[PDB]
Amino acid sequence: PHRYRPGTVALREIRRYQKSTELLIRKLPFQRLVREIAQDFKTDLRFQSSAVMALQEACEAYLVGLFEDTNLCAIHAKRVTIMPKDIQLARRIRGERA
Amino acid sequence: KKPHRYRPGTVALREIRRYQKSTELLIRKLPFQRLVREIAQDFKTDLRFQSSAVMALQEACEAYLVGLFEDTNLCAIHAKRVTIMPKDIQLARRIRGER
Amino acid sequence: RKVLRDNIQGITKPAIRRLARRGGVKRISGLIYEETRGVLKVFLENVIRDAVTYTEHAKRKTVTAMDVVYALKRQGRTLYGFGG
Amino acid sequence: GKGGAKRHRKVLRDNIQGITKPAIRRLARRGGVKRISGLIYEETRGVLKVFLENVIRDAVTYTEHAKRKTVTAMDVVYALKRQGRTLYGFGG
Amino acid sequence: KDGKKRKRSRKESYSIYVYKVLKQVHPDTGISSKAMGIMNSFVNDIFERIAGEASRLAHYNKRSTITSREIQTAVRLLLPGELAKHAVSEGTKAVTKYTSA
Amino acid sequence: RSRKESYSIYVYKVLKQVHPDTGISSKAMGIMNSFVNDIFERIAGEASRLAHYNKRSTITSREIQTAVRLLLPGELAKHAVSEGTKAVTKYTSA
Amino acid sequence: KPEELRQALMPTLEALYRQDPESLPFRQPVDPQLLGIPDYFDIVKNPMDLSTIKRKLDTGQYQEPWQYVDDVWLMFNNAWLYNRKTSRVYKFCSKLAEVFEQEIDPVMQSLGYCCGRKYEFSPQTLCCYGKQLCTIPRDAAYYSYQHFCEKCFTEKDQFEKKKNDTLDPEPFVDCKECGRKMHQICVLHYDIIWPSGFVCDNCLKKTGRPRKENKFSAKRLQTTRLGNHLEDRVNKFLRRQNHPEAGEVFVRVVASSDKTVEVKPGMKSRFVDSGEMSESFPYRTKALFAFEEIDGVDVCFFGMHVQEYGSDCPPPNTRRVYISYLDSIHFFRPRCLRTAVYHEILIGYLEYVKKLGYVTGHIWACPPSEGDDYIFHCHPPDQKIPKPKRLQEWYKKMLDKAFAERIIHDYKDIFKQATEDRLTSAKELPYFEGDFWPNVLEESIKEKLYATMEKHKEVFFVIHLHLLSCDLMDGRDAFLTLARDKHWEFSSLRRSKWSTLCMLVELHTQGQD
Amino acid sequence: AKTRSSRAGLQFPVGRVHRLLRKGNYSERVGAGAPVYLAAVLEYLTAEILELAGNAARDNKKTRIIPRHLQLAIRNDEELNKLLGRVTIAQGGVLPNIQAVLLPK
Amino acid sequence: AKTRSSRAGLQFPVGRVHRLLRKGNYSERVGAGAPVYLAAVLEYLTAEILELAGNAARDNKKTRIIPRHLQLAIRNDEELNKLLGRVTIAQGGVLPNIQAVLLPKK
DNA sequence: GCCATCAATATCCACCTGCAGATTCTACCAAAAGTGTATTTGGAAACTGCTCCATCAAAAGGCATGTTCAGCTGAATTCAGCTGAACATGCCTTTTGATGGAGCAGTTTCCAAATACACTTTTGGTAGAATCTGCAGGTGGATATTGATGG
DNA sequence: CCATCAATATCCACCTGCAGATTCTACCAAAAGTGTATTTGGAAACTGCTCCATCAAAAGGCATGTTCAGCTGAATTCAGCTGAACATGCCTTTTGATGGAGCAGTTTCCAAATACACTTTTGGTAGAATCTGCAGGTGGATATTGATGGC
């Protein structure tokens, strides 16, 4: 059976998703989460489709930028696998936590 | 007969406490007015400096450096180390976005 | 309206893996998925709180993309293509 | 003139070198740094140097607008404000 | 004496008001000039921040007047729960007292 | 319905000037309109702040030029200043 | 002899050497090549240093020590001139010079000379001639030939352009017997007083007869009832105090005449043409001065002028006295009674006119501007100029003290007095020569009067109480001009003594009676 | 008769705030209650910041507020910490904080 | 019958941007040359970014500018990247960038 | 390897005392600040036209979810070259105080330059239909890329 | 380890259907611009007052060299974590249609904001004189940590 060594498919999809720009998180789970937490803030609210698209794109950009920060922080410790303390440090440097 | 010598770190921790409990400026004055004078004349020749403006610049620079230094210490201790390294300051400046 | 809940798991493991790959991450740990879900969630209540307060200031019950642009701009995360 | 025109003319120190490395060590102690690598100081010099053209130039760019050549505390504090590092106490 | 050499530079400052507030909150506590400048700068920059938020709230919704609701929502944006609720309560009390005055 | 102005036609004219055979999508037009509106708001607000700082109640070319210098770095700033001087000279020459 | 001069002058010079590091640059002659100052000889024509002084003393090249003093001051001036005030050498020279004054006097006082200081008069200001009214400004470019201002000649190149910075040295006298050079001010010798020449006290000690009595003293000046009353009151107060440092005080009126004040053209047209008041108001002017016995000589310490309108003067000036100018010197002994003495003068005047029948007195309490001398030229630099509030408090204390003795019936300010009198026209204001109010009214006519009174409320004081011909003292201008021309300064005790002696001689010999 | 600040029971000047709003070019028209609410909000924030500054001073055995006490007060309250988190404080120093790895043993 | 936009030799409407300046509540008064300068700056920025976007599209064998082309233009110009460092382009993506360490370590 | 403890040290505190800095009191006044009156107006309510916001049907293929094996990556352990920490030594550079004038601000004039607004003309959105067009998407095969197969 | 080879993802040219980009016809109200009228921000000249650069001494530090305990990375080994692959199936994603809650346009109009005009108070500023919080200076003194030493 043909099998690729670990990391080859991961790097292939790294170029694949760095080449394309389509929305990468599927829509309605994000829509439903937004609806739930907004109802937690305020009930009986309504949402435009463009508004949900804007939320999705902004959150994707925020998480992906956190992901380059994550890779830099991880390779900072001579590592190629990411663990939560990496983004914790990244956010505390960014000022998001402290 | 073997004059008294503190181990590496005890005096370092003492200085940590001393400079975290105090608020006086740490950058010497006259070099700072010099630096601002040459760097300002690099943009506009024959500038004049107020004492308050220089004090504000010095305080802002010290605050920026000290905060970047906790950032750098955090980056260093993240790598299972105690000594700050140029990769630590580069990572801190990259994450801050200034680079 | 129905009181829906527990859709934070809707941010699937392959989706978070894809987002990490787009960010240049080669190897991902197990708890990364859920803890980045938490970080995403936090950003979500912050942004929607700002947007919903914007909308309530306008005496509207429908959240528009324009107030979303307002919230992103006021959070230092300005977004283009949706107005503003 | 004559006499006293040779007061501390050892100008043989670079402008960036005037940061007085023990002051950098003091700042690190205030920053909670326990151990410092030997060649760190100079790069921090450059780093702080960068911050200066990040800040003072802005204030300097203010100066010609008011038809002045003297930088004031208001120019400095507003240059800090526009850069996201607002300062208190020099707004009088 | 026209063109008096003493002074004509009336500098806007909230010093006496901050001192009075210190008196109500702490009658037997002093204050330094540098700390007073810190207080003046803090209250100032908070003023421009809140005024800018109110102005943008008015502008974006095609509203040409800044009213109490604008500053209500501006405070809600700028301040999280505890500070926001306390500030809203005290401001509502103040405006109610002013209206009933 | 309420009129909603946009800079689509001016951007189209500019891109014809710089690229006669290049088109743009509607989403690209939205991105460009958002960018121009955001930079307009930023530099106009900086000019307003600069006018307020010097107790000045009018936005003229000098303070808006200074604000552009503050926000635009380097080569873009020099090009903007030079083109603005040329444009104001042309405007006042007629 | 060189030996005595050396044994005298080594202590002060060695004390100058003791100062370090101030005296280090003065150990050797200035070398332009070594110091890199090729322009040193372009500015300093005759340089000298401490080593030159030592070598010149060691060879006995001095026959009298004033050459030593002149050389030391000349090298001090060279050091001050070539070097900038902020430089090392300037302040080093200042410290060395200060040590020089601190050390020179006791040494040279034992060698048979009056003192050891080099004295230079204040910069003598000149006066214009084309305009006959303006003067030559000090420390500025001036025009002169064989003197004009910068704006006089402008409304051909033979003029000489310079800046007024020259100084006048003190006059020197040579003893007819010894020949030693002496300061004329220090020895208090004057040619008309002593036509036989200047003889030092040492020579008169070899003769037995001391210096003959000076007939040109303040005591022998013509006495007047007002001056006699003032001097009697001052002497009685001093006797009651019985201060050991206090001396006899002589008050003499040296000038008295009758003049008229003319209404200025604006008020002449506004009020004189209608005939409600006369064109001019007659009055009597008097000048009195106070002299005290200090160190065996008379010292002038007070001067003041009055204008007296009698009962025949038309209103509103009828039966009034006005204090025009007031001046004083703070060298009175003791200082603690100085102020207390001044009261006893002016209060004594206020009572005296009260005995004559005068009803109203006027005081213009305005502090002098810096550089403006009222009566005495060259006020001492260390004499404090009182603040206007201080001067008002001083006058209020005077009026309260006089009220305590039941001499003054009341005292107010001009604004409150006008409000109480229900004055409705500016014509009711008193008219005095050179007074501020006539000029204010003229300015108002040229272009709110009660507002002007209120602004200067504390300046003017109104007091309710109920011939010697001398051209020199007929007004404050002639005496000031003569003092400036003859360098009659009151800046120091010895200079004040010399000026008092000169003015007493002038009054005694140049009078018109 | 009564000042707008007194009518609202506020120490801060309502009229001065309204004048600043007029000159600040935030809107050509300003509501009547906007300066009152601004005065109340700034009074509130001043009240707790000075309260915490006095608490820090009395914990530091001091009776005069100094910028060190001001930073100790502002940083120790996490909400107040984020209010001035992107703000540089003069003459305040830093909080006493040492990492676990830095401590001996 | 000459418009002030054509009078200044600019493509952007000076009148509209001046009206927006007046409506923007920046001060009590607005100078005459300020809208001209503002329009010139805006047109220069849009011209530069559109030229870069067209170059990127040509590099991608594309003749229609898409948000991906705009993102490529904004990110590959360090000055323009500094201009838009805190702004997200919708449907723009990220630059292809893989660290050397991420590459195989054979 | 633990730890109980002579001994030098910086520092907390018990105290203090003089001074720069903070606090108290009297007085003037232009600058706001409060109140009165006529004017203008932005937005409240009232009703309604209308766009998209929310909601239910259906199906089938794109990934979502679960399981397995192991490649190798993260984690723990030793240790040795060595870079920095602590410290004594020498001296020099910094800090504080005093002093000319280069410009920071206050006063006055007046003109090129800014609003207010009533028209008139050009012009930028834009309902609506028609033609043009770049690339979404599927096909097929030559082309690198990866991994471990014979030896 | 260097060489070939098989399984596999990639590039890419090509061709077809179409939502979207581009071209006109006509419309049309919102601006744009010209020409008076009115007002004012500020150019420009002259000048008093700050305070900033320059220069001095007194002093609180900074710059080098030495010794070495401890820091960091290279080398080594290994448990198990997640990547690659695959099977099963979940739910997706669109295309479609629909009732109506809700967004927004239009009309009316009034309490609220504004522009003066006048009277009232009042925070700034300057100078005098009183009060004091605390920065250090001096006497212990105290964990405290490195070191000597005993178990």
Author numbering:
A (entry chain E): 38 to 135
B (entry chain A): 36 to 134
C (entry chain F): 19 to 102
D (entry chain B): 11 to 102
E (entry chain H): 24 to 124
F (entry chain D): 31 to 124
G (entry chain K): 1086 to 1231, 1235 to 1243, 1264 to 1555, 1620 to 1638, 1655 to 1701
H (entry chain G): 14 to 118
Published text:
Here, we report cryogenic electron microscopy structures in which a p300/CREB-binding protein (CBP) multidomain monomer recognizes histone H4 N-terminal tail (NT) acetylation (ac) in a nucleosome and acetylates non-H4 histone NTs within the same nucleosome. p300/CBP not only recognized H4NTac via the bromodomain pocket responsible for reading, but also interacted with the DNA minor grooves via the outside of that pocket. This directed the catalytic center of p300/CBP to one of the non-H4 histone NTs. Representative writers of lysine acetylation (Kac) are E1A-binding protein p300 (EP300; KAT3B)8 and its homolog, CBP (KAT3A), which can transfer an acetyl group onto the NT lysine residue(s) for all four histones. That is, p300/CBP reads H4NTac at the bromodomain pocket, rotates in multiple directions, and rapidly writes NTac to non-H4 histones within the nucleosome independently of the DNA sequence.
